[PDB]
Design a binder for this molecule. Structure first.
Ligand SMILES: [Cu+]
Ligand SMILES: [Cu+]
Lengths: 156, 154
């Protein structure tokens, strides 16, 4: 099932929502930590709002982003749980996600750092372009930013 | 914004071939210089109803790889070949390339459309598909080609 995380946030003509599901299985295998080695599938749900700066019609999935996440158990002085999401498709459409192993039931904080197509850290920079001519060009890509939420994990 | 024939409904997607004047793009070094090209050729690919790879109708189909072959009818030159690149423009994301043609006249335009997991698709390690019963989708479509007749006005 789905376990939404807080309320969606917006920036730069995109809506950013966080949710987790039960761990999933994915092709290509050997990318997702196996479902049996995980507690949840964390996801970032990112869609264009109106007047999107890069030409996306409202509602379109925003592709070719790179998302790094940090999940910290509240009150914990231990190391945060970190990883990189991967772009993928599921029955509900494309999203960014990762299978994650948590640190038991309780309160967590979740931070997503969202990299644009042209960020150094985004491995997809050489594969996705942007028109820059006057007639068909669009605005520059957004700059890297982070968004945070709190959530409770009960065990699924 | 100019059409190459009419769109074809294939593999749960509308595949349209269009073109416009040569463009400029970030990142540099992928498109041929606009001044050294004749057109920007594009593949406009969106999901139809009941798309089997998880896309709601009208969505752009991302992470594909498109190779094109443009042949002048009766031409003695080599066919014009290349790879499109995914990119965004004012009307949305598409696949495109700046192309130099071989003068005005009749051409055949063929696109070979590769799914995310094709050997030929360099984006295969970057795009996944859920396979579990609850949230999975059907296997990626099989690589296919689509052709049209094109008259270049010059
Ligand atoms: Cu996923
Ligand atoms: Cu383009």
């Amino acid at each position: 099932l789905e376990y939404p995380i807080g309320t969606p946030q917006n920036l730069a003509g995109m809506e950013i929502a966080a949710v987790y599901l039960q761990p999933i299985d994915m092709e290509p295998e050997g990318h997702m930590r196996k479902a049996s080695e995980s507690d949840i599938h964390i996801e970032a749900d990112i869609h264009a709002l109106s007047n999107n700066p890069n030409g996306y019609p409202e509602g379109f999935w925003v592709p070719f982003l790179f998302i790094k996440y940090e999940i910290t158990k509240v009150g914990g002085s231990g190391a945060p749980i970190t990883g990189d999401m991967m772009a993928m498709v599921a029955s509900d459409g494309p999203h960014y996600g990762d299978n994650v192993k948590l640190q038991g039931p309780g309160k967590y904080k979740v931070k997503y750092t969202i990299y644009p197509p042209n960020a150094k850290e985004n491995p997809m920079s050489p594969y996705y372009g942007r028109h820059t001519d006057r007639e068909t060009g669009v605005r520059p890509w957004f700059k890297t930013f982070s968004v945070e939420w709190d959530f409770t994990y009960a065990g699924i």
